[PDB]
Amino acid sequence: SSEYIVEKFLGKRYLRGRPQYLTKWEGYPIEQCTWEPLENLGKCMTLIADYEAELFQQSR
Amino acid sequence: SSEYIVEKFLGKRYLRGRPQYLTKWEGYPIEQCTWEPLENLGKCMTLIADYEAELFQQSRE
Amino acid sequence: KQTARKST
Amino acid sequence: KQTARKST
């Protein structure tokens, strides 16, 4: 009832010590992105691993 | 196939710029652990999230 | 198709 | 249970 399609991630944070990702949903404006817990992003692992790889480069 | 049960992670690194986790397999000794790419651990997301939370608090403390 | 629960 | 492919 509350599942949507992930397009991209737009940020990372820790909330009470736990990793979250700022999640851009396909078919919704960027204004509607939401912070999501990493444990809920299991079906998005290519997106996650690619995003972590992007961050590692950008953070040289 | 080549699919096994993950018990815990034992380390984190970047290989060619991509995240990997040192994976301890249930039912195999620690000497048998293997470095695995993150994108292959989708079924292990609770363990990864819990491990990343561990690494954060062990860093801060 | 990569999907996930959305928080509200 | 939580499973993954194992590298060689």
Structure tokens at A44: 């998005």
In chain B, whose CA is at the least distance from the CA of A56?
B17
Q: A1 to chain C: nearest residue by CA? A: C5
Q: Is the distance from CB of B9 to CB of B21 less than 8 angstroms?
A: yes
Alpha helices in chain B (DSSP H): 45-60
Experimental technique used to determine this entry = X-ray
- How many structural domains is chain B composed of? 1
The CA distance from B22 to B25, in Å, is 10
In degrees and rounded to multiples of 5, residue C2 shows phi and psi of -105, 120
Spacing of C-alpha B11 from chain mean position: 7
Query: Edge-to-edge strands of the sheet including B18-25?
Result: B34-37, B18-25, B3-15, D3-5
Final resolution, Å: 1.7
Q: What is the DSSP string of A4-20?
A: EEEEEEEEEEEETTEEE
- Tokens representing B21? 């986790």
Residues on chain B touching A57 (C-beta within 8 angstroms): 17
Residue matched to tokens 């990493």: A38
| C8 min Cα distance to partner chain A (Å) | 8
Under 8 Å between Cβ of A26 and A6: yes
First to last CA, chain A: 41
What are A33's two structure tokens?
A: 């992105």
Q: Quick check: B44 and D6 CB within 8 A?
A: no
Residue B58: give the domain boundaries.
1-61
CB B46 within 8 A of CB A15: no
**Cα end-to-end span (Å), chain D:** 22
- Please classify residue A30 by burial: count the beta carbons closer than 10 Å to its beta carbon, then call 0-12 exposed, 13-18 middle and 19+ buried: exposed
> For residue B39, how many other CB atoms are within 10 A of its CB?
18
